[PDB]
Every structure is written in C-alpha cells, then in structure tokens.
Structure 1
C-alpha cells in the first residue's frame, strides 16, 4: 500500500510494542504498590483459645474469645521513601525503553519494506537477464540451424541460461520470505507495495558529524537509560545509608476479650474486658555486624558499574553515529559509481555484440558482459535502498526517529508494484 499506512497498521497491531507498554504501566502502578506501606495499614484479628493444665495447673482451664482492630502507621522510615523514589526512577527507565521500542518498530518496518522492494527489483533484473540470455541463445540456435554458428556457442549459452534459472529460483524464494517477514512485522499480507521513484530520486549530504554527536549525546535513548541507571544507583546508595536510621511506627488497637476461666481449681474471675490503646514504637539498630557498612560499599561499586556502563554507551553511540555517517556517504559514492558502471557496461555489451558480429569477441564474453551489466544494476538498486536504511539508522542513533522521517521517505515512494512472482 505505502510505507506510512504500513507503519500505522504496525503501531496499531504490533505485539512487542504493546508488551513494552504493558511493562511501563505495570511499573507506574508498582509505584503505588510501593507507596502503600507509608499509608495506614489497618487490619483485624481474632482468637479462640482453650488453655488447660498439664502439671501444677491441673483443672485450671480457660476459654478465651479475643478480637482486635490493630492499626499501624509510619512516621519516619526512609527505606520505604527511597524504595518509592527507586520505583519512580525505574518507571522512567521503562518509559525510555518504550520509546526505544517505538523507534525499533519504525526501523524494522522500514527495513522489511525496503528488503521486499529490493527483492522485487532483484527478481525483475534476474528475469531480464534470463530473457536477454535466451534471446542470444535463440539467435545462436537459428544461426546454427542455418549453418553459421557452431554448437559450441549454443552450449555455452545453454549453460549460462541454466545458471540464471537457478539464480532466479533463489530470488523468488527470497522475495516470498521477505513478504512473510513483512507480514510478521505488520500483520497483513501486502500484494501491492509502493515502489521507488528513481526518476526523481536524489541523495542529500547529511549534516555535520559533530552536530550529530551533540544531538545524540543529548537525545539518544541508550545513553539516557544509562544515566538514569546511574541516578538509580545513587538513590540505592542513599537507600542503603538509610539503614543506620531509626524507624517510628504509630501503633493502635481496639482490643477486646472474653475470658471464661473454667475448671474445678479455677479460682480466677471470669472477665469480659475491652482494651483500647495507642502508642509508638521506636527502633535504632546500633550495630548489626556490618550489614549497612557493606550494603553501602556494594551500592558504591554498583554505581561505579553504572558509570562505566554509561561510558560504554557513549562509546557505542559514537561508533554508531560515525559508522552511519560514513556508510551514508559511501552509499552516495557507490550510487554514483554504479551508475557510471551500468552505463559503461551497457556500452561494453553493445561493443561485444559488434565484435561477435565481426569475429574478434566471443559469445562467452557477450554473456559475461550481460551478467556484469545486470549485477551492476542489482548493486545500484541495493545501494539506493541501503542509503535509505542508513539515513534511518542515523535518525535512530539521534533518537529523532518518528513518523515525520517516514513521511519524508514516503514522499520518495511513487508508483505501486506487485509482490507476485
């Protein structure tokens, strides 16, 4: 149909993106799950015991029926506060991952679309190669039936034709499997896609690499995730440090009991009482053997690990940006080179035909020139499509990949073409 519509259908019906969204929302709710303990923790309890006497208390039994409405509340517990902040930061991380999955979806959809298109172009060029080989083979066959050309040329052409047939089979299989991958990405089978407009296709030199690097270190996603994890490790250090601190707990209750002491020797008086109390509960772990002073060092070493992960991510980002810039410029230069190559190879094929007419060159040279020509055409098409893919990879490293780049692309796509075979 088109690239934009394909991305729409994907975004609407892609499961990996939906799973990342689910995880994001699950984290944003784990936030409340962690806020819970800082809120009142009202409860309720009961009991019914039957005490007896095994020795020295013989015949002194009892029948209790107790209830309780225990309530709890936390006035100072920094560990829970830090866990809450940690969960907020993890939610931010999962949001970043959702963004990354959006970008990955756009990129994979475009990659599959252009793989399908390159497969179509390759199949068409291979079929054209086969047709040209068959034309030459038929010419030689007729000129042999009359008595001009020898069986040698016929057999050479037959061999080349068979090889081309095998290559065509391979190309058809590749095209079908590419359509299947496109389906796996989007969900539907596309019998007609939007082709490329080479009559107006043009390449634009990318922007300065230093500006790309600034925009990347500012807006990239893996780097952002790394620095978020660094902040998370800092907060973990603080969480561990908070182990040295006290923990208040405003308790409360509405206790009630119904004692019914029984037995012969039972002397105590049956009492049905109710006890309501409200009090605090301090705590201060003076010493624990080194749990806190060890968790702190662990958290500091994990913070070091996160800092090093951040540096590694910066290096990977620089590599990605530089490689994408370089291979974009390379795709441009190769487009130009393969254009010149196609022109020169068509000229050389005409010259080889002239020579075969004369007698200098041989049909094998003609067929090799034809193969070279059509291989050059294939390489040119693949270079165009790789240029597009590499532009997208650039815009991905920058984290500025969105439907707008896909619109800029779709502006390029022109007439439709079938995925048949």
Structure 2
C-alpha cells in the first residue's frame, strides 16, 4: 500500500530477521553455558562390585556397594574466566550481526518495492510506445488504402510495431517477477502500491564526503564487527598465554560404603564405612612440550590477521561510502540530463512528424524518433528510482539506516497504482 506498511509487514514476518534474532539469543544464552564451569558442580555416583581372586587370593571374594556425593568448585582457573569473556565478546559480535541484518532487511524491502514501481513504469511506457507506433501504423495504412502513400511505409511501421510487441511481452514478464520478489521479501501479494510523486520530486545533494567518511568510521557496522573481532583476537591471545598459570579446586565429597567379604580364605571382615572429605587440589603445568608457547604464537598471528581484516574493512567502508556519494551525485546529474533529453526528444519527434508531412523525412525516422522519446522517458524514470536507492545506499554505508529513513521515502511517494500487468 506504501513503503511503511510494506516494511512493517516485512519486519514482522521476514524469516531471515527471526533467524538472526534466534542466533543472537542463542549466543546470549551460551554466555551462561560458558559461565557454568565456574559455579559449584555437584554430582552423585554409586558403584556395585563383586571382586574375585585367582592367584594367592583364591576364595577371597568381596561384595562392595558404594555411594558418593562429590562436589567441585573452581577457586582459580583463568582459562575458564577467559572462556566466559570470550563468549561475552562473541555475543556482542552476534548483536552487531543482528543490527546488520536489520539494515539489510530495510534496504531489501525498499529495493524490492522500488523495483516493482520501476517495472510498473517500464510496462506503462512500453504500452505507450506501442500505442504511438500503432497510431502511426494505422495512419499509414489508411493513407495507403486511400492511395496517398506506398506499401513501404506500411511494412516498415508493421515491423516496428511487432518489435514493440515483443518488448511489451518482456516488460510484462519483468513486472510479474518483480511482484513475486516483493512478496518473497515481505510475505504478501500487493495489488496496489503507493506510486512515486514525480511532480513533488526533489533531489538534494548529500553532505560532503568527509562528513560521510567520519560518520561511517564512527557508525558503520562492517567496522564495528572488525573492531570487535580484533578485541576478540586480543582476548584469545590472553586466553592462550593463560595456560602457564596454575589452577585450584575445592573438591569435597561425602562417601559411604558397604564391604561384605565372603570366602573360605576370606580373612577380612564386613564393614560399613563412611567418609567426609574436604580437599583442595592444586595443579601447575611446568613443561608441556612447547604447546603453550606455540598456542600463544598462533594467537598472535591470528591477532595480526584480525588487524589486517580490520584494515580491509576500513578500506571497503571508505570505498563504498565514496562510491555511494559519487553514485548519488551521478544520479542527480542523470535526472537533469534525462529531463533535458526527454524534452528535446519530444521536440525532435514533433519535428520528424512535420518533416514527414512535408516529405523532408521518412516514416522510419518518425518511428525511430518515437522509440528515442520513449527510451528517454524510461531512462528518466529509472534515474529517479536509482537516485532513491542510492540515497538509501549512502544511509546504509554510514550504518544509520533505520525506520525514519523509510519515513522520508514514504513521504516522497504518492497516489496508489496497480501492480497487475493489465
């Protein structure tokens, strides 16, 4: 119906966002799985054994029934604290990816909607071109049936008309596919969409590219992901060089046992045993074969790789920001150029009609001028829609693409128009 309602339906139903949100929540919950090993771990065990000896122990059999309640707590284990911190950072990265997916949905919805609008305009101008060429063909056919013109003009007009008929077929198919893609994005079939208001259509120059680059370096999401991955690589170095450190544990236990010795040579006696241990274990790896040093060096190389990914992301951001700036400026210049071209092509079409009436020109020239005029109109329409999409591409490069940027567009739109290819 318009761009806001389309985007709201999409945001509510689009499954890609809901999957990205699922991933975000899965990471933010895995934080707790990573924190768990630091919390007291209680377990229970129970054993039943029947031991029988066969060498200097013949006829010395035993029946043991034991049950233990083991507890374990970690007083000092830095590898697990680093794992918890690593998981927090990974959750942050997932949140940034979710933001990127929100922006991707906004941009895809806008692009699909305007693709449908562009396809409606293309079909409308293909039909107008067909009507114009058919008008010329009918005029020539009449002037021939009367005897004021030869069959050459009739045949030429017919050939041009048939070519335009094939273009109409292509345009109808493209419109149908544009509507199918829009429904894939949103989830609904839209028979009427708000159309662009070409009368109240304004082209504003984007702000200086230096301000765009500053805001992009500060806000762009492909950079936040890279900075967070760099921090993650630093924390991975720290986790790696935390293997030299010792660990403490507070293993406690409450055990009970029932021993029943049953054998002819069984000298031992039955027992009902109990125990309550409160232990404290300390571990300190001294030499691991160079495993820890190698892990630390690998982590340092991974940090170098992450820094280089950050530089690559910065270069891609700069490139895309400047490209979008140039593309908007070019779309403005193109809108103005095509407006002039459309005006001059209408003038030239009138000139060809006059010349053909006075005999200075031919009919192939008239039909070529008609084709030129309607190609200029199609190019102007596409230029407007590409200007809108390029504004959106800038706002995406800065990472500041949100619903208000769609409210602006929805304000640029106007009366509804049907998406049916009829």
Hey, what's the Cα distance between the residues in 2 that align with 1:376 and 1:318?
Answer: 33
Residue in 2 aligned with 1:163? 163
Matched residues in 1 for 2:54 and 2:15: separation? Answer: 66
CA distance in 2 between counterparts of 1:389 and 1:56 reads 91
Q: Deviations over 1:212-251 (max 9, x none)?
A: 0000000000100000000000000000010000010100
How far off is 1:55 after superposition? 1.2
Displacement of 1:185 in angstroms is 0.3
Distance 2:193 2:45 in 1: 68
Structure whose residues are more often strand by fraction = 2
Measured after TM superposition, the shift of residue 290 of structure 1 is: 0.6
Equivalent residues, number: 421
Counterpart Cα distance in 2 of 1:323 and 1:273: 80
Residue 210 of structure 1 corresponds to 210
Tell me the alpha carbon deviations over residues 38-96 of structure 1, each in whole angstroms, 9 at most, x when there is no partner: 00010000000000012110000000000000000000000000000000000000000
- SS of the aligned residue for 1:70 comes to strand
Quote the offset at 1:334 in angstroms.
Answer: 0.5
Q: Deviations over 1:193-220 (max 9, x none)?
A: 0001011101000001000000000000
Match of 2:260 in 1: 260
CA distance in 2, matches of 1:345, 1:235: 65
| Matched residue, 1:271 | 271
* Residues in 2 aligned to 1:53 and 1:108: alpha-carbon distance in whole angstroms: 76
Q: What does the per-residue CA deviation read over 1:339-359, in whole Å, with 9 as the maximum and x for residues that have no partner?
A: 000000000000100000011
Q: Is residue 317 from structure 1 mapped to residue 323 from structure 2 by the alignment?
A: no
Structure 1 residue 122 corresponds to structure 2 residue 122: yes
Tell me the alpha carbon deviations over residues 315-341 of structure 1, each in whole angstroms, 9 at most, x when there is no partner: 000010000000100000010000000
How much has 1:2 moved relative to structure 2? 0.5
Q: Per-residue deviation at 1:259?
A: 0.2
Q: Displacement, 1:28?
A: 0.5
CA displacement at 1:16 relative to structure 2:
0.5
Q: Note the residue ranges of structure 2 that are not aligned, 5 or more in a row.
A: none
Specify the SS of the correspondent of 2:281: coil
Deviation at 1:102, TM superposition (A): 0.2
Please name the residue that 2:384 is paired with: 384
In the TM superposition, residue 171 of structure 1 has moved relative to its aligned partner by: 0.3
What per-residue deviation string (whole Å, max 9, x for no partner) do you get for residues 289-313 of structure 1? Answer: 0110000000000000000000000
Q: How does 1:219-368 map to 2 (within 5 A)?
A: 219-368=219-368
CA deviations 1:15-37 (Å, max 9, x no partner) are: 01000000000000100001000
Task: Report the Cα offset of residue 262 of structure 1.
Answer: 0.6
**1:17-56 aligned within 5 A:** 17-56=17-56
C-alpha separation in 2, matches of 1:22 and 1:208: 39
Q: Could you say what secondary structure the match of 1:149 adopts?
A: coil
Distance (whole Å) between structure 1 residues aligned to residue 312 and residue 361 of structure 2? 58
Q: Distance in 1 between matches of 2:402 and 2:409?
A: 11
Q: CA deviation at 1:284?
A: 0.5
- Deviation digits for residues 159-215 of structure 1 (CA, Å, limit 9, x no counterpart): 000000000000000000000000000000000000010111010000010000000
State the alpha-carbon separation in 1 of the partners of residues 54 and 236 from structure 2.
53
Q: Return the alpha-carbon distance in structure 2 between the equivalents of residues 87 and 386 of structure 1.
A: 42
Which SS does the other structure have where 2:278 is aligned? strand
TM-score, normalised on structure 2? 0.99
Q: Deviations over 1:377-420 (max 9, x none)?
A: 00000000000000000000000000000000100100000001
SS where residue 52 of structure 2 aligns?
coil
After TM superposition, what 4+ stretches of structure 1 lie above 6 angstroms from structure 2? none
Query: How far off its partner does 1:361 sit?
Result: 0.4
Residues of 1 paired with 2:54 and 2:263: CA distance? 13
Q: CA deviation at 1:269?
A: 1.2
> In structure 1, what is the Cα distance between the partners aligned to 2:192 and 2:329?
31
Report the alpha carbon displacement of residue 278 of structure 1 after superposing the two structures with TM: 0.5
How many angstroms apart in 2 are the aligned matches of 1:26 and 1:182?
A: 30
Q: Distance in 1 between matches of 2:252 and 2:13?
A: 52
After superposition, the CA RMSD in angstroms is 0.4
Counterpart-to-counterpart distance in 1, 2:285 and 2:327? 61
CA offset digits 1:238-297 (Å, max 9, x no partner): 000100000101000001100001100000111111011101110000000011000000
